[PDB]
Structures are given as C-alpha cells and as structure tokens.
Amino acid sequence: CAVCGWALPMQALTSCECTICPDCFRQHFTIALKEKHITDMVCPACGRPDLTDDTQLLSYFSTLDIQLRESLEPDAYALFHKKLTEGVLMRDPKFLWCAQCSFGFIYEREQLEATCPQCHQTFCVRCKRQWEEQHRGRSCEDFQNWKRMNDPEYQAQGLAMYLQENGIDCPKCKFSYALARGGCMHFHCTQCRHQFCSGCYNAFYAKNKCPEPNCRVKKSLHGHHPRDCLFYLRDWTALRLQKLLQDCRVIEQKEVPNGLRDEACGKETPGLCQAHYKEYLVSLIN
C-alpha cells in the first residue's frame, strides 16, 4: 500500500497503478462519494486523472466500475452511478427534473406546458410551477402575480385592510359598508334604518326622541358624543391638534340633479384642505 505501507498480493487505474490495500481502498472511495464529488474519484496516492474534461479519459470510470462493484457496499456503489450519470444529465441539455416527483427526462420541445411521464402532473418548464391554463400564453411573472392576488387570505387581508382604511360598520346591526366621503357625521344605515356618528359610533335621535337621562336638548335633532369624537376635535384648529400628538384631491361622492357622482374635493390646501387635514390628526389620536 502507498497510503498505509503493506506489500502483499487489482488497481490498474489510469496514469499510475500504485498499490492500495482493500480495507483502505473501500474507505477512500466510500468517502469520495458520500462526501467529495465525482472530480475527486481519484487515486489517493498519485491524485491522477484530471476529471475536469476528457470524455475518452472517462473510460477510466469504466475500469473503476468493476473495482467498486464488490468492494463498496451497494449503498455507496449506488451513489457512484447516481453521481456519475446525473453528472452528464446536468451538462447543458434540455434536461428537466420533474417539478413534483423525483423523475427526470430530456424535454426536447418548443413548448412550456410539460407533463411528466411518471407522476402525470403538468408544470411550466420555465417557472417549474404547477400548470393551470391561466398561464397559457402569459409570461411567468404575470401568472405568478395572478396566483398571489387571486389566492384567498391575500384577498381576505387585502379586503380586511381596505375596510380598516375605508370602512364604516353600522353600530346596531354591525353591517359593514365602505365609506363614501363628502358626507357628514350623521349617517343612516340602509339595512336597519339606524342613525349614528362617524367618530364615536353613538346614536342620533330625531326631535322628542332622546332616551338617555340628563339630556338637556331633547327637543332638538342631536346625538351624544364623548370628548374624544371628531365632532369635538373638529372645532380645534390645526394649531392645537398638532401638539397633542407631539406629546385638495380627496374623493367625495357629490349629488347632481340626476344622481350621485364621485369627484375630488377641489378645496384650497393651506396638501389637504383645512377640514381634511384636521380629520388626519384626529384619527391618529385614536
């Protein structure tokens, strides 16, 4: 042995033919498959052939094959085959691994829709993702948007947040609407006919209808509000509103003679108008 120093009665391998004992012959190559890669399936003593390139020199592997067949336990002798043939498979062809199973095949076509011989599932050869016909004649990033936008839970949250920003939920029957701006504080729920405030959600009562006790102006149209409500903080100018927190093109639905039509605010901006910029700061305090 070169590596461990015996001299007893196989290793006819290219550029060399050094002696190697069979206990440490196995171990060198068993390591070189289970740890190193194919380029490293070399003589330990000389370190020679150069397996970067030459294909007919890869006749070397034919000769190895027999030696490893019996010496290597089949676990690692498998890996010799696996590594070696998978090596050339991944050398620039139109070779694909199937996107779902462990199979592969040389896909020589002018097409993207590709069904797998083995598991019979289809995928895009480019994005290697399961093929629905939505993809058909669409770029990969296009289809992959569709998926993402169209998937519920994204939709669920994209909505849920939309209602976070733009919603308004009748306090009585709890029905969720989408707030049309331009209107005033006193709302009418189109489902159950209730009346209420935009800020506090406390109710509104018509003339001679307020039930809550210690009401002073029961005679009038009114509703009861907390200190917190936009109602009360709308009466503060920008000036005062600002320091509490330290410590125009908004779309209103506007009535015309034959219906309602959305239009921007149009108001002079001292980039929001006086009123809208006040609504801005009020919201942040809650």
Give, as ranges, the residues between 140 and 159 that touch Zn ion (CB under 5 A).
Answer: 140
Q: How far apart are the C-alpha atoms of 45 and 20, rounded to whole Å? A: 9
Query: What's the chain's Rg over C-alpha atoms?
Result: 39
Q: How far apart are the C-alpha atoms of 85 and 58, rounded to whole Å? A: 12
Residue 248 annotated as part of some ligand binding site: no
Residues within window 55-74 making contact with another protein, judged by CB under 8 A: 55, 58-59, 61-63, 65-66, 69
CA angle, 23 then 26 then 30, to 5°: 140
Q: Which residue lies nearer to Zn ion by CB, 157 or 212?
A: 212
Closest C-alpha to 185, from 114, 275, 70: 275
Q: How far apart are the C-alpha atoms of 265 and 254, rounded to whole Å? A: 10
Interhelix angle 22-34/74-89, rounded to 10 degrees, is 40
Is residue 52 within the footprint of another protein (CB under 8 A)? no
Q: Smallest distance from the beta carbon of 127 to Zn ion, in angstroms?
A: 3
Residue 28 annotated as part of some ligand binding site: no
Q: How far apart are the C-alpha atoms of 232 and 28, rounded to whole Å? A: 84
Q: Which does 58 bind (CB under 5 to 8 A by kind): another protein, Zn ion, none?
A: another protein
Q: Which of 17, 50, 142, 228 binds another protein (CB under 8 A)?
A: 142
Q: Report residue 44: phi and psi, to 5°.
A: -70, -45
Residues within window 214-233 making contact with another protein, judged by CB under 8 A: 217, 220-223, 225
Q: How far apart are the C-alpha atoms of 234 and 255, rounded to whole Å? A: 24
Q: Smallest distance from the beta carbon of 180 to another protein, in angstroms?
A: 4
Is residue 16 within the footprint of Zn ion (CB under 5 A)? yes
Q: Which residue lies nearer to Zn ion by CB, 117 or 158?
A: 117
Is residue 154 within the footprint of another protein (CB under 8 A)? yes
Q: Smallest distance from the beta carbon of 157 to Zn ion, in angstroms?
A: 25
Task: List, by residue number, the catalytic residues.
Answer: 184
Residue 229 annotated as part of some ligand binding site: no
Is residue 182 within the footprint of another protein (CB under 8 A)? yes
Q: How far apart are the C-alpha atoms of 242 and 177, rounded to whole Å? A: 30
Q: Which residues pair with 205 in a beta bridge?
A: 222
**Contact set with Zn ion (CB under 5 A):** 1, 3-4, 16, 18, 21, 24, 43, 45-46, 98, 101, 103, 116, 118-119, 124, 126-127, 140, 170, 172-173, 189, 191-192, 194, 197, 199-200, 210, 215, 225, 229, 231, 248, 250, 265, 267, 273, 276
